[PDB]
Structures are given as C-alpha cells and as structure tokens.
Amino acid sequence: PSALNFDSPSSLFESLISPIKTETFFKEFWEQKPLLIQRDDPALATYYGSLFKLTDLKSLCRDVNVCRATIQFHQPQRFKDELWRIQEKLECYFGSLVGSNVYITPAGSQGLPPHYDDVEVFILQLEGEKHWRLYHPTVPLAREYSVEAEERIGRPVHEFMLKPGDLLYFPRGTIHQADTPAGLAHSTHVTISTYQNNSWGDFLLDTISGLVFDTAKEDVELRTGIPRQLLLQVESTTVATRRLSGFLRTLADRLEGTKELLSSDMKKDFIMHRLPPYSAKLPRLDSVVRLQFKDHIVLTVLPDQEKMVYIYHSLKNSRETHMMGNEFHGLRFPLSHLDALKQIWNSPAISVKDLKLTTDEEKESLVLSLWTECLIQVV
Amino acid sequence: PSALNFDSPSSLFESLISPIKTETFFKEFWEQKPLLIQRDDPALATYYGSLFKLTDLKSLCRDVNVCRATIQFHQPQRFKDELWRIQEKLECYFGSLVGSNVYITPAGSQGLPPHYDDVEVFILQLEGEKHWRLYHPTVPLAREYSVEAEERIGRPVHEFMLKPGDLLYFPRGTIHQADTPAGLAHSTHVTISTYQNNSWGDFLLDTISGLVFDTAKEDVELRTGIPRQLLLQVESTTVATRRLSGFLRTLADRLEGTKELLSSDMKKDFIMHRLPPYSAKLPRLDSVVRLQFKDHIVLTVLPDQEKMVYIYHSLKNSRETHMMGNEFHGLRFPLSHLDALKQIWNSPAISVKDLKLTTDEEKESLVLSLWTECLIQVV
Ligand SMILES: O=C(O)CCC(=O)C(=O)O
Ligand SMILES: O=C(O)CCC(=O)C(=O)O
Ligand code: NI
Ligand code: NI
Ligand code: NI
Ligand code: NI
C-alpha cells in the first residue's frame, strides 16, 4: 500500500502521499499549508533511494549547477525512468507541467538562503538527512520566485529533519530554507514541482480573447474605434478606464450565459511540452472503439492556419527535452466532426456508426485517422 | 486653402477633407456614414494627378497585383514622396498605421466584386473617372474583410462618379463596388486606409494583462490555482464561467479607481511599423529644451529584458518597408526618471534643472541621451 501504484494517474498520486487521503489533501493542504509526511518504511526508503543517487551524477558527468556548496541537477526525468514514470502520471493527474530538480549538499553545509518558490512542490528525501525550516509566506501563493531577508521571514512555523522515505509538500509562496546536518552523510532530495503560472489570472488572460471576439461580434460598441492618438499619450484618461470598466462588465454578464471558453495558449503549451507516456485490430465501421491515452490528448477550435477542430497529443513528445525549454503533433478536422469527437471523448465505448457524422466513409475515415495517431482502441 | 498644408499633422487633415470642417467630420461622419466631397478645383485636380500616374507603374516595373482586369499597386508611399509626406502626417494625426493601395482599371471594365473592407478609407481620384455604388453595411464597423452576394447587399444607398480632385470617405463595413465607365480614359485612384484592428476590443485585450497582473498582486483569489485537468476538458463548466465573471467584475471595479493602463503590444507595434518623418546647439543643464518629433515618440514601463521606462521612436524607420510587413530603436531608463520624462512631455518648454531628478549629472546625462536620438531641441 505504501509502494507506488502506477495503474492509473489517480492511483499513483494516492500512493505518493500515502497514508494521507487525497480528499484530505485537497481539502486542507493543497494551496493552503505545508504537509509533512514522516514515514517508517524501509522498503519505501530503499525505493526512494533508487530514484537518484550521488553516483547517478558521475554516470551523467545546463545539466547540473553549483550554488555556494549545493549541487543542483536539472530535470533528472530525462534519464531516470522511474521519475519519468512518476512525473508523467503526475502531469496527467494535475493537468499541468511537472518538472523536477535534484539537490545534493555535503554534510554540515548550509544550502540556498531563505526564499520562496513560484510552484507547488513535492519533496522526496532520497539519501541522507536535511534540516528544514518553513516560515509564514510574505506573499501567499506567490507568482514569482524570490529570496527574503532573515529580518523579514520571522520565526519558523515548522521545523523538521527529513530522511529517506519522507515526503514534504508546501504551496508556492511558502518561505523555506534547509541545511545538511554536520556529520558524514550528505543530503540528496528531488523537488517535484508543478502548477507554475496555472492560476485563474492566467486562465482569465488565456481565454479573454475568445470572449471579447465572440462578444464583439454582437456588440458594435466593442467594434468601435479608439480615440485619436490614444497610443501616443503618456497617461491614461478617466474616460478610457470608465469605458473599459463597462466593457469588462458586459463581458462578465455575457459569460454567465456562456458555456464555451477558448484557450489561446494554455492547452497548446501544456501538450506541446509535457512528457510522453512511459514506454520503457484495425477498426471498421461495425467496430466498438474508445479513446486511449486520453490524459495525453487535448482539443480546441482554431483558425485553419476556416475554424477547424484541432487534436493535439503528446504521444510523440521528447522526454530528453522535457522542461529544458530549448525549442505540433496531432490532427486537423472540420467543425462538422466536433460533436462526433465529443461523443468519442465522453463515451467509455461507442460504435463507429453511432458517430454523428454525415456519411459512412468519413464515419470510418475519422476513426481511422485517430487510430494511426495511436488515440483509438478497439474492444 | 484647398491645397494641402503640411505645417502640422492637424493642419494637413484639415486640408485633405476641405472644405468639410474636422469638427463636422468626427461628429457626423467618422465611423458612422460615408462622406462624398465632390470638388471643382483644377489645381487640386492636377495635384491629385501627380500623386500617382499610370506611367509611375512602368518606372517601377508583391509590388503590383492583377484582379480579373484591375491592377493594384501596393504601398506606393515607398516610392512616392508626396504620399509618404501625406500618410506620415496622417499617422501622427490618427495614431494608427496608415497604408495605401493604388487601383488602376481600364475603360469600360468592372472592378472587384461587391465587398466591404476592415479599415477606414480615404479615396482620392487621381486619373479618369470611376462609377461608385455604396450599400448599407451588413456588418457595421466590421473587423474582417469580406465579399458579399449581390442578393444580399440590397440596393445602393449612394451612387456617384468620382473624378480627379474628388475625395471619398467611408467607415469599415461599408459595402461597395466600382467600375470604370465605358470610354477611352482609365481610372486611377489611391485608397488611404487606417484604423485597422484599432477598436476598443483590441485595446481591452492590449491592456487586460497589466490590469490582471496589478490586481492579482493584491487579490489572492486571482493567484489561486485552477481545478485539476481543467485544460484536459472538452467543455467548459458553469463554475469556471461563473468564477471568471466575478473576476471580470472585480477588475472592472478596480479600474474605476485606476489611472494607469499598460500597452502590451499596441504602442510598440505602431511605432515599430509606422513611417519615418518626411525628410526629403548642444544642451547644458542651464539650457531650455523641448521634445521634437513628439508625434513619433512613445513611452511605457516594461521589464528590463527591473521595470524600466522605455522610449521608442520611429525616426529611424524604413519607408521602403512600410506596411510590407516582411520583418527596436529607442532608449532605456530607470523608473526614477519617469516623472522627469513626463515633465518633458507635457511641458512646451523646460529647463534641465527643473527635471525632477536626483543629481545634476543624470539631469544632464538624460537630456543628452534624448538629444542624440534627435528627440530634444534647444531654444
Ligand atoms: O536543498 C536546499 O538547499 C533547498 C532546495 C529548495 O529550495 C527547494 O527544494 O525548493
Ligand atoms: O477600384 C475598385 O475596383 C475598388 C477598389 C476598392 O475596393 C477600395 O478602394 O476599397
Ligand atoms: Ni526552494
Ligand atoms: Ni541545521
Ligand atoms: Ni475595397
Ligand atoms: Ni458603371
């Protein structure tokens, strides 16, 4: 029960934070307060120790980093399978990119100075022990990374010692600092982070375009031009703001009677950069098929590059470049197939004929396209 | 009085639409209805005929185009000085890009089919005569260009014959079509268009980022994360919309007590692409200086590339590439100089000492920087 169960994405997250119940996690901890899970499991401790060892550093020696005294290995999932398998499922579960960093510090040495990150972290102690001290956030759910002055963080709210097998979680903004106790053993943990720039402010901005565009199609006021030279001014004018206020309110109202939101980049960016699935009968129109690798698929309606249904998937993504950000697989379809696509999605199973399409050739053609992209499966 | 007065941008627009008064224009015509200005001025007619001749086509023969029967020369201001001088001032006046196209059609031949443009046009008859027919807009102040079916445009609302010296204006969305009367003479006019994508919907979207960012800095709710897998869904959820509605309303309210709006790209794009000014004593701290080429300057506060005052100008822009869009001059300053910058702007004159800056070296240094960029002038 303490071992990681990779059956499903949700089954994995359950085991990762075991014995804490997921229901409890999201209810009292997630994006609220830190959660220390000290364990007593020799097996899990040994498992954890396999995720990344000091020696793994030499075997693989931008990849690493040194902070005066602390060695940081970036995105180990590009080489370590177990982690790739872990973070992959985490991405499916959270629906957000999930990267990780490894921190290695020698005995008796301090680590990075007091600071707070801009992501949700999941710390796993792999080797040795680390002295942690968490402080109250100066910026709850902070959006950017920052270091703070000791004269500002106040006094620790929670202090502890992590050892192999333990797991530490805390929301973005949580000020922290750690050091390796004097002695012989060095410390080694990996920090699995997610939910970066995945707030409502990001969602609002990632959907406001489609809203304005759809609304302006019926409100001539939005289609009206701006004052002359407005862009040449050095200071905004009350009218302009007053005007924009009404427009925001109009948008608001229209939204209530809305059921569609368009992702300008969020969806695309996620699928485009996420990890590929851990990978270490031909359909007829009489067949019964269903989506596979759903947690790796995404769809939206965008211009041709008129408006067509686009299917983006990450089955062909590179794990060697995950999160390194040093650089579009899918399918294009006419709106007429949208509903059909939505049927396939929700339906746990479905017959090719039941597709709400015009003719059987396209009824088949479609499922045949999806099949070549490894998205469809026959029963 | 009918001749074009290039003293100032505003003096030019006045002469362009002469004898119509600008006050009348913006009050009853601009973005409202078409305005036909038939004239009787042999001088102006001859002037107009110089702006672009059939022969100018050969002298310069993506540049041209042929539509079955109609020849379209694109962006003539890249070679014709008078036009460059005209459109430049128009850009200063409108604060929006101002491009132009030339249409040449032989006698007795129809032109493009019925359609409506997505820009504010200013048609100038240069040679010959053209039979015009305007129809009611099917999409008032349309945002995109489109052709319409004769079975839809209804019956002409205004019909006329343009001849050298005349000027025709109509807002975007105004359906139209023209043909060259049978005979000997061909038609030649230039269409000066502006205000493309310069609506409130564009402004809202071009400023919403800075608003959310500034608001989220005090509203933790905006900083809160989105539901898991929200980006993996195929259909929005009432909650999400309801949520976004409140956020829009919050933004609205905050705006009322706001006095600052940030341009994400609008300003930058304008200066970056506009035309350069028509171009065919060293300052001391005791000097009295004032901005020159103001209508060609713009400022905003953006990340370093922390937040610094950026000055962008178009004095070094290429007229040969204007509006061809087949591809950043300015200065960087610390916020501490912003107010000083704003002083220089509003002030019709000002002494270097009066700059609200810390020390005299920077009081001078600043004005010296601006001076090398050709922005400052001494009295
Ligand atoms: O190990 C350390 O010194 C601290 C690492 C850290 O800041 C983190 O895991 O977020
Ligand atoms: O000259 C023509 O045939 C029509 C040109 C046109 O559509 C325009 O000037 O907007
Ligand atoms: Ni950290
Ligand atoms: Ni310690
Ligand atoms: Ni037209
Ligand atoms: Ni005719």
- CATH number for the domain spanning B311: value is 3.90.930.40
At A243, is the secondary structure helix, strand, or coil? helix
- What's the CA gap between A59 and A65, in Å, rounded? 16
**Beta partners for residue A158, in sequence order:** A134
Resolution (A): 2.8
One domain for residues B157 and B238: no
One domain for residues A109 and A43: yes
Binding annotation of A for Fe cation: 115, 117, 176
Q: How far is CA B24 from each of CA B18, B19, B21, B30, B54, rounded to the nearest angstrom?
A: 11, 11, 5, 9, 34
Q: Which residues contact B202 (CB under 8 A, 6 or more apart)?
A: A226, B266
One domain for residues B164 and B109: yes
Looking at the structure of chain A, the number of domains it has is 3
- CATH number for the domain spanning A253: value is 1.10.10.1500
- What's the CA gap between A180 and A186, in Å, rounded? 7
Residue whose C-alpha is closest to residue B176's, from B134, B148, B124: B134
Distance A145 CA to ligand 2 centre (A): 55
| A230 touching B (Cβ < 8 Å) | yes
Which helix (H) or strand (E) segment is A336 a member of?
A: none
- What's the CA gap between A161 and A171, in Å, rounded? 19
B99-105 and B187-194 as β-strands: parallel, antiparallel, unpaired?
antiparallel
- What's the CA gap between B74 and B101, in Å, rounded? 5
One domain for residues A82 and A144: yes
Q: How far is CA A284 from each of CA A51, A287, A372, B311, rounded to the nearest angstrom?
A: 44, 5, 13, 63
Query: What is the amino acid identity at position A84?
Result: W
Q: How far is CA A169 from each of CA A35, A108, A116, A125, rounded to the nearest angstrom?
A: 5, 24, 13, 12
Method of determination used here: X-ray
One domain for residues A62 and A73: yes
One domain for residues B249 and B282: no
- CATH number for the domain spanning A149: value is 2.60.120.650
One domain for residues A160 and A48: yes
Which helix (H) or strand (E) segment is A21 a member of?
A: none
Whether residue A133 contacts residue A159, with contact meaning beta carbons closer than 8 Å, is answered with: yes
Ligand 1 touching residue A103 (CB < 6 A) = yes
- What's the CA gap between B315 and B293, in Å, rounded? 8
Q: Which of B222, B248, B265 is the last residue of a domain?
A: B265
One domain for residues B228 and B276: no
Check A142 against B223: CB less than 8 A apart.
Answer: yes
One domain for residues A205 and A186: no
Whether residue B378 contacts residue B283, with contact meaning beta carbons closer than 8 Å, is answered with: yes
Check A216 against B208: CB less than 8 A apart.
Answer: no
At A297, is the secondary structure helix, strand, or coil? strand
3-class SS letters over A83-139? HHHHHHHHHHHHCCCCEEEEEEECCCCECCCCEECCCEEEEEEEECCEEEEEECCCC
* Domain around B212: 200-265
Check B259 against A241: CB less than 8 A apart.
Answer: yes
Q: How far is CA B145 from each of CA B168, B175, B263, rounded to the nearest angstrom?
A: 19, 10, 26
Write down the residue that tokens 């379809």 correspond to.
A333
One domain for residues A25 and A156: yes
Measured at the CA of A223, the angle between CA A221 and CA A227, to 5 degrees, comes to 80
Whether residue A162 contacts residue A103, with contact meaning beta carbons closer than 8 Å, is answered with: no
One domain for residues A124 and A27: yes
Residues 70-109 of A with CB under 8 A from B: 93-96
Task: Compute CA B14 distance to the chain's CA centroid, rounded to the nearest angstrom.
Answer: 17
- What's the CA gap between B57 and B211, in Å, rounded? 49
- What's the CA gap between A143 and A256, in Å, rounded? 28
Ligand 1 touching residue A117 (CB < 6 A) = yes
Which of A197, A199, A345 to mutate: most B Cβ within 10 Å? Answer: A199
